[PDB]
């Protein structure tokens, strides 16, 4: 395993190099919004992001060493979390707006056009505002995203101790980044705690979002791809 | 089996 | 400008330890039905909640918040608080959940109630995780206080986050006391706080289950429990 | 206007 043989800098550059591209939406400024249309846009984007995410996870150090079965499980639990922290990250410098795509920038008012959406919009906007005041760096973001992929499903399965080992390495990397930025030890630990506590909120937003996705599936007016349905079924809501 | 399974294989 | 920030790490620890709620008992019993087990658990939850409120008021910095901010934090976190408490006292009972000293249940009994076994397994997994980490009581009370102040902080600021830093310092101070190196200190801190993500997840699953119990309308739910539940939608 | 208010104030 080369994942535990990587330095902090080698960890950072690897994660940075593995970054998925910013995809565009099929958004038509001519077309008036409807519920079905806006949701259709968002579910379509998510489906396309998923393909890039799955191939991104392969390039996360340590993920390849897991069994296929364990890879499937981690991605099934964490996929909406990964999307969400990605959405929040690229929305950082657009206060009061979520940048789903470069051509798809939405405020909370447009989230109200979809019943039950607004609550999730506000939580995402608050997360994005929190990253802004912390001045979250790209190097820290990619660490947090990899932590989510490895940590979220680890309590729901010999192989775990390897996962926790990789997780410990990423923690080392975060601290290395903070010490590099001139922070004191007290500040390093405080910032580390601040960043990891965000993940609690990201889990919460995902759980809520998953429930919303389940409801969309039931009223059956918004087209959901087969992959998106399978990720949804993986959480087994009733 | 499922799609995620296949995409993780290729 | 208040008193929580002035405390030392040891004064923080002793305050939290002193504020700990008591271990409550369940009713003395006959094999459990779905309604009987849920009755005992909801009854227990209601009595634990009353002690949780007084416990919360004794967490340094919580009294400085407005009445409405205190309400928001508790409404958001109450099930999380119950769960880490349940998980904590279940540590020395592998494969079992110690709801009360006279209510020690395993996963087979979680199957007395539909949809309960998954929550049971998640709690059990969390408990053994704490066990394998050798979680200390001083670390536990820090984690529980953290859950209280953090879970609802993104659904409202500065005071709360300063108290959170204060507890992080206290957590690190505890690990430095135990003889852990700097690397082990921030590694363990990370390991502990990542558990809170799972605890959040368990609480969200548990909240949905409580909602469906309300809809079934067979298990008697107190008005307090009903209000705490309705705050999440 | 809730039970939680009473418990916190007492
Ligand atoms: C607003 C939130 C509700 C999440 C609940 C939901 O409706 C998911 C289906 C629509 C997808 C939205 C979406 C798509 C992406 O490519 C990235 C994302 O972060 C999201 C997303 O976070 O949706
Ligand atoms: C099993 C789980 C399902 C959570 C869902 C649920 O049924 C909540 C209502 C019954 C109360 C359970 C309970 C009571 C306590 O005093 C402490 C607890 O940790 C719980 C609890 O964790 O409930």
| Chain D CB contacts of C72 below 8 Å | none
For residue A108, say whether it is annotated as part of any ligand binding site: no
Beta strand segments in chain A, E = 98-101, 104-106
Q: What is the residue whose two structure tokens read 């799955």?
A: A54
Q: Which one of A80, A192, A204 would you mutate to disrupt binding with C, by most C Cβ within 10 Å of its Cβ?
A: A204
Report how far residue A188's alpha carbon sits from residue A175's, in angstroms, rounded to the nearest whole number.
Answer: 6
Ligand nearest to the CA of C48: 2
- Closest-CA residue of A relative to C185 is A189
Distance (Å, rounded) from C-alpha C211 to C-alpha C229?
Answer: 7
Q: Is A120 helix (H, G, I), strand (E, B) or coil?
A: helix
Q: Under CATH, which number does the domain A1-238 receive? A: 1.10.565.10
In 3D, which of C228, C32, C62 has the Cα closest to residue C144? Answer: C62
The resolution, in angstroms to one decimal, equals 2.4
Q: Residue C152 — φ and ψ, nearest 5°?
A: -105, 5
Under an 8 A CB cutoff, do A193 and C197 touch? no
Residue A62 Cβ < 6 Å to ligand 1: no
Q: Please state the φ and ψ torsions of residue C223, each to the nearest 5 degrees.
A: -65, -35
**Joined tokens for residue C199:** 């605890």
User: C27-36: long-range contacts at Cβ-Cβ below 8 A with a sequence spacing of 24 or more?
Assistant: C28/C102, C32/C109, C32/C112, C33/C112, C34/C112, C34/C113, C34/C114, C35/C218, C35/C219
Q: Testing the interface with D: which of C52, C53, C225 to mutate, by most D Cβ within 10 A?
A: C53
- The burial class, CB within 10 Å (0-12 / 13-18 / 19+), for C133 is middle
Radius of gyration of chain A (CA): 18
Q: Is A90 among the annotated ligand-binding positions?
A: yes
Cα of A51 to nearest chain C Cα, Å? 25
Please say whether the beta carbons of A199 and C197 come within 8 A.
Answer: yes
- Contact (Cβ atoms closer than 8 angstroms) between residue A79 and residue A229: no
Residue A113 DSSP SS3: coil
Q: 3-state DSSP: chain B helix, strand, coil percent, rounded to 5?
A: 50, 0, 50
Sign, CA dihedral A201-A202-A203-A206, equals: positive
The two three-digit tokens of residue A182, written as one number? 């001139």
Residue A163 burial (C-beta neighbours within 10 Å; 0-12, 13-18, 19+): buried
- Distance separating alpha carbons of residues C7 and C5, to the nearest angstrom: 6
Residue C178 alpha carbon to ligand 2 centre in Å: 33
Give the residue extent of every domain in chain A: 1-238
CA of C38, closest atom in ligand 2: 10
Displacement of CA A205 from its chain's centroid (Å): 11
CA–CA gap between residue C61 and residue C157 (Å, rounded): 12
What is the number of the ligand closest to the CA of A206? 1
* C-alpha–C-alpha distance, residues B1 and A222, integer Å: 25
Residue C79: C-alpha distances to residues A118, C86, C115, C206 (Å):
24, 10, 17, 8
Q: Give partners of A (≥3 CB pairs < 8 A).
A: B, C
- H or E segment at C71? helix C67-88
Query: For chain D, how far is it from start to end, CA to CA, in angstroms?
Result: 15
Is residue A149 within 8 A of residue A62, CB to CB? The reply is no
Token look-up 């580390």 returns A192
Task: Write down the CATH superfamily of domain C1-233.
Answer: Retinoid X Receptor (1.10.565.10)
The rounded distance, in Å, linking the Cα atoms of C210 and C224 is 13
Q: What is the CA radius of gyration of chain B?
A: 5
């Amino acid at each position: 395993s080369l994942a535990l043989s990587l330095t902090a800098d080698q960890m950072v550059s690897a994660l940075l190099d593995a970054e998925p591209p910013i995809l565009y939406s099929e958004y038509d400024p001519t077309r008036p919004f409807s519920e079905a249309s806006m949701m259709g846009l968002l579910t379509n984007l998510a489906d396309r992001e998923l393909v890039h995410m799955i191939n991104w996870a392969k390039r996360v150090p340590g993920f390849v060493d897991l069994t296929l079965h364990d890879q499937v499980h981690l991605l099934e639990c964490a996929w909406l979390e990964i999307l969400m922290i990605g959405l929040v990250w690229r929305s950082m410098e657009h206060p009061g707006k979520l940048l789903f795509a470069p051509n798809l920038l939405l405020d909370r008012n447009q989230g109200k056009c979809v019943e039950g959406m607004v609550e999730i919009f506000d939580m995402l906007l608050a997360t994005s505002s929190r990253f802004r005041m912390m001045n979250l760096q790209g190097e820290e973001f990619v660490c947090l995203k990899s932590i989510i992929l490895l940590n979220s499903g680890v309590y729901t399965f010999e192989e775990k101790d390897h996962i926790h080992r990789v997780l410990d390495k990423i923690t080392d990397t975060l601290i290395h980044l903070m010490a590099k930025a001139g922070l004191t030890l007290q500040q390093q630990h405080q910032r580390l705690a601040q960043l990891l506590l965000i993940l609690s909120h990201i889990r919460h937003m995902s759980n809520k979002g998953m429930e919303h996705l389940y409801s969309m599936k039931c009223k059956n007016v918004v087209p959901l791809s087969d992959l998106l349905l399978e990720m949804l079924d993986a959480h087994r809501l009733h | 089996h499922k799609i995620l399974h296949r995409l993780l294989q290729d």
